[PDB]
Amino acid sequence: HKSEIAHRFNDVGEEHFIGLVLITFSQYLQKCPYEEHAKLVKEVTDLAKACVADESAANCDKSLHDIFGDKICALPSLRDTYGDVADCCEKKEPERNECFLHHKDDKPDLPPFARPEADVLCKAFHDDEKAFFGHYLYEVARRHPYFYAPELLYYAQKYKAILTECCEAADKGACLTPKLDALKEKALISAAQERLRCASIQKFGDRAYKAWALVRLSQRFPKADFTDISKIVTDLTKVHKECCHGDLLECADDRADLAKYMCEHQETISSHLKECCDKPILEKAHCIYGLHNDETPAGLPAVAEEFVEDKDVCKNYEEAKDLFLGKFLYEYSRRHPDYSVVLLLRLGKAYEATLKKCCATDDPHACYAKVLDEFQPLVDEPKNLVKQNCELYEQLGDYNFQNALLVRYTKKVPQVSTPTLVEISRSLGKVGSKCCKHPEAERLPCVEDYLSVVLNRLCVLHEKTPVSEKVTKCCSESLVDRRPCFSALGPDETYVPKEFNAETFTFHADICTLPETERKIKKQTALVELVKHKPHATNDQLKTVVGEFTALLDKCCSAEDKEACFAVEGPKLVESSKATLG
Ligand SMILES: C[C@H](C(=O)O)c1cccc(C(=O)c2ccccc2)c1
Ligand SMILES: C[C@H](C(=O)O)c1cccc(C(=O)c2ccccc2)c1
Ligand SMILES: C[C@H](CO)OC[C@@H](C)OC[C@@H](C)O
């Protein structure tokens, strides 16, 4: 393997190679049209093929970054399409590659992912599968420039499974949509989980992600020994570092090598692996990625005996910190399948901080004897929040619960851009729908782990154009304390309210063309803007002025001439709003 391109082509096979290269280009160049990307893919794939034939062929010895780079720059369009991706080809490797990476956009300016009509969609699918899935991987990857690439391949396969079933049946849409919405929601959660893994590695270092993986894998495979869970964490950290950095072919090859390793060792890892290890490669790794927890081995000693009683606690911590704190996370997490990963990391942090304090005293055991008892308040803190918010979710339902959170978050961090506030509050709402229904003991980990990915999305959206200082502080001070940090924010009483824009409540007629989902987004946008104008208004005053947004909408979109309805109701809403809010 002196030729990388040949080595990856041979390892992943033509079909995945082509998909991974398409995703690679789609993530780096999110604005470029499909045609350009398919050209680059063929050019790279032709080069791959020339090298597999004869490793001595021209460019066969380049790095994958060189090859992607040399194909990108030779392309006619880029400098006109992009201002600052013109900039990058003005560097050499590794600077050139690093540059492309920093331009990845977490919210590229693109219209929503078009879901054509059921028969239309089924027709495209039968017409030309290859073109259909190429467009699919492009449209998702460009909108989610850190999506776990091997998993995006899996989603394309699932999408094909769903189409194959539904497209032939008597009603199309009726079969299709509940499945395509299930799939979309599962893929969005996948993208948000991977975005958190990349942000952990990139902002906080490999160790931030290794501790998170150690905890999760300890809980999933508690019968595995610390050595094996450690080897898996190491390999997984490498896989995610590669995928998060755009080394998609290496990431897919390494992930497939890991799945193969775990299958070849399943007896000593988990009996639950047999489900997965019988499947084809993408289903097999997907299955492993989300596998349900094994049962805890019977007969494990009391966790106090290694971590509080052993005379060598301070010695171990001082002489081999990561090994000893890793063993702490492995032992505590395997014993606690029903804690969120983040709580287990916060307990790991408290245990560490207690050792740091206690081991510098005359009597460390006297100092840290109660360390494990001192966890309970941390355990109990996320409980009260979950119970109060899940009863509010139960009572208000999705739409009003989202509204409630929208008003609460806009008052906490009112400098945040309205689209971000809307998107985050809507996501925080979906945590209610996903989590509140589970038995109480599964609720905590569901909610807490889900809130991590939603807050990380807020942090990554805010990172690029920082506008609020509390968000910068909560996002930058920790990974694991982000949720308590945001929880503790009261209303910002420092923010100067915005004065009243006429232009905020009339969006011409294009609004009349929007599906139900988008109308609600528009209402929610108006709500955020009302809160930014009048942060002290009552919930009922807010609702009223939105109710009157609901009217001016129904009115012009019930009326023959919406435009003339606009002159009559648009300012008049300026008026009725003054009446209601002052
Ligand atoms: C009174 C009620 C409660 O606490 O039981 C409550 C509390 C917070 C929010 C809301 C809303 O649904 C809402 C809807 C639109 C705009 C603003 C608020 C309702
Ligand atoms: C952290 C943040 C805050 O309050 O600062 C917040 C906002 C809304 C809800 C929750 C929840 O715990 C929760 C519980 C059930 C469903 C969805 C969210 C937490
Ligand atoms: C191109 C090929 C069509 O048969 O795509 C099928 C879907 C399921 O997968 C996408 C490829 C890239 O793995």
DSSP secondary structure, 267-320, as one string? GGT-GGGHHHHTS-HHHHHHHHHTPPPPPPPTTPPPHHIIIIISTTHHHHHHHS
Nearest C-alpha to atom 1 of ligand 2 is from which residue? 487
- Give the span between the Cα atoms of 250 and 441, in whole angstroms: 39
Nearest C-alpha to atom 11 of ligand 3 is from which residue? 19
User: How many degrees, rounded to 5, is the angle at CA 112 between CA 135 and CA 128?
Assistant: 20
Token pair belonging to 257: 């090598």
Determine if ligand 1 sits within 6 Å of the CB of residue 539: yes
Classify 247 as helix, strand or coil: coil
- Give the span between the Cα atoms of 500 and 514, in whole angstroms: 25
CA distances 514 to 325, 426, 562, 570, Å, are: 53, 18, 14, 19
Nearest C-alpha to atom 12 of ligand 3 is from which residue? 19
- Residue 366 C-beta-side C-alpha neighbours within 13 Å: 4
Mutation pick for ligand 1 pocket among 403, 425, 520 (CB with most ligand atoms within 8 Å)? 403
Token pair belonging to 325: 């704190």
- Cβ < 6 A, ligand 3 pocket: 15-16, 18-19, 129-130, 133, 153, 156-157, 160
Determine if ligand 2 sits within 6 Å of the CB of residue 447: yes
**527 Cα nearest atom in ligand 1:** 16
Name the residue with tokens 């964490």: 233
Token pair belonging to 564: 């003339």
387 CA → ligand 1 middle, Å: 17
Token pair belonging to 241: 């570092």
- Give the span between the Cα atoms of 369 and 373, in whole angstroms: 9
User: How many degrees, rounded to 5, is the angle at CA 372 between CA 206 and CA 374?
Assistant: 100
- Give the span between the Cα atoms of 353 and 344, in whole angstroms: 14
Q: Give, as one character, the DSSP assignment of residue 335.
A: T
Which burial class, exposed, middle or buried, applies to 450 when counting CB atoms under 10 A from its CB (0-12, 13-18, 19+)?
buried
Cβ count within 10 A of residue 461: 20
Considering only the top CATH level, what class is 118-201? mainly alpha
Nearest C-alpha to atom 9 of ligand 1 is from which residue? 404
Ligand whose nearest atom lies closest to the CA of 403: 1
- Give the span between the Cα atoms of 312 and 154, in whole angstroms: 47
Token pair belonging to 251: 């990431």
413: Cβ contacts below 8 Å, ≥ 6 apart: 421, 468, 470, 471, 489, 492
Cβ 106 vs Cβ 2: under 8 Å:
no
Q: Nearest-CA neighbor of 151 among 13, 284, 282, 8?
A: 282
567: Cβ contacts below 8 Å, ≥ 6 apart: none
Ligand whose nearest atom lies closest to the CA of 530: 1
Name the residue with tokens 């990349």: 198
- Give the span between the Cα atoms of 46 and 571, in whole angstroms: 61
Ligand whose nearest atom lies closest to the CA of 550: 1
HEC readout, 437-480: CCCHHHHHHHHHHHHHHHHHHHHHHHHHCCCCHHHHHHHHHCCC
Long-range contact pairs involving 80-87 (C-beta distance under 8 Å, separation at least 24): 81/29, 81/31, 81/32, 82/29, 82/31, 85/29
* Type of residue found at 146: Y
Q: How is the chain split into domains, by residue range?
A: 4-100, 118-201, 202-290, 303-380, 381-488
φ/ψ region of 254 (left if φ > 0, alpha if ψ in -120 to 50, else beta) reads: alpha
Q: In this structure, is the dihedral angle defined by the CA atoms of residues 563, 565, 568 and 571, taken in order, positive or negative?
A: negative
Determine if ligand 2 sits within 6 Å of the CB of residue 474: no
Token pair belonging to 579: 């009446």
- Give the span between the Cα atoms of 345 and 215, in whole angstroms: 8
146-180 burial, b for 16+ CB within 10 Å, e for fewer? Answer: bbbbbbbbbbbebbeebbeebbeeeebeebbeebb
Cβ 419 vs Cβ 497: under 8 Å:
no
* Binding site as annotated, residues: 1, 4, 11, 65, 238, 242, 245, 247, 250, 253, 257
Determine if ligand 1 sits within 6 Å of the CB of residue 400: yes
Nearest C-alpha to atom 3 of ligand 3 is from which residue? 130
292: Cβ contacts below 8 Å, ≥ 6 apart: 220, 272
**455 Cα nearest atom in ligand 2:** 1
Token pair belonging to 6: 């040949």
CATH of domain 4-100: 1.10.246.10
27-64 burial, b for 16+ CB within 10 Å, e for fewer? Answer: bbbbebeeebbbebbebbbebbebbbeeeebeebebeb
CA distances 245 to 101, 149, 213, 370, Å, are: 7, 11, 18, 43
- Give the span between the Cα atoms of 527 and 519, in whole angstroms: 12
- Give the span between the Cα atoms of 523 and 101, in whole angstroms: 36
- Give the span between the Cα atoms of 138 and 306, in whole angstroms: 51
- Give the span between the Cα atoms of 38 and 26, in whole angstroms: 10
Mutation pick for ligand 3 pocket among 129, 154, 162 (CB with most ligand atoms within 8 Å)? 129
Q: Give, as one character, the DSSP assignment of residue 172.
A: S
* Type of residue found at 70: D
| CA end-to-end span of the chain | 73
User: Per-residue DSSP letters for 528-569?
Assistant: HHHHHH-TT--HHHHHHHHHHHHHHHHHHTTSS-HHHHHHHH
In CATH, 303-380 is 1.10.246.10? yes
Cβ 246 vs Cβ 101: under 8 Å:
yes
Cis previous bond, 497, omega within 30: no
- Give the span between the Cα atoms of 119 and 115, in whole angstroms: 11
The per-type count for the chain, helices as H runs and strands as E runs, is: 28, 0
- Give the span between the Cα atoms of 290 and 275, in whole angstroms: 12
CA distances 92 to 98, 100, 242, 471, Å, are: 10, 12, 20, 35
Cβ 406 vs Cβ 459: under 8 Å:
no
Q: Nearest-CA neighbor of 194 among 226, 154, 229, 230?
A: 154
Nearest C-alpha to atom 6 of ligand 2 is from which residue? 487
Q: Nearest-CA neighbor of 447 among 465, 463, 431?
A: 431
Determine if ligand 2 sits within 6 Å of the CB of residue 389: yes
Q: Nearest-CA neighbor of 232 among 261, 202, 271, 211?
A: 261
Q: How much helix, strand and coil, in percent to the nearest 5, is found in the chain?
A: 75, 0, 25
Classify 245 as helix, strand or coil: coil
* Type of residue found at 370: K
Cβ 528 vs Cβ 406: under 8 Å:
yes
- Give the span between the Cα atoms of 524 and 403, in whole angstroms: 7
Cβ 406 vs Cβ 425: under 8 Å:
yes
Determine if ligand 2 sits within 6 Å of the CB of residue 341: no
133 CA → ligand 3 middle, Å: 6
- Give the span between the Cα atoms of 392 and 407, in whole angstroms: 14
What does the chain come to in residues?
A: 582
Ligand whose nearest atom lies closest to the CA of 537: 1
**448 Cα nearest atom in ligand 2:** 12
**159 Cα nearest atom in ligand 3:** 8
157 CA → ligand 3 middle, Å: 7
Nearest C-alpha to atom 10 of ligand 1 is from which residue? 404
Nearest 5°: phi and psi at 129?
-60, -40
Name the residue with tokens 């409540």: 505
Helix 4-12, helix 64-74: angle, nearest 10: 100
Determine if ligand 1 sits within 6 Å of the CB of residue 403: yes
Experimental method reported for this structure: X-ray
Cβ 406 vs Cβ 525: under 8 Å:
no
CATH of domain 381-488: 1.10.246.10
Cβ 194 vs Cβ 151: under 8 Å:
yes
Asked, colleague to colleague, whether 202-290 and 381-488 share their fold, the answer is yes
In CATH, 202-290 is 3.40.1280.10? no
* Type of residue found at 116: P
Residue 252's H or E segment, with its range, is: helix 248-264
Q: Nearest-CA neighbor of 91 among 119, 112, 69?
A: 69
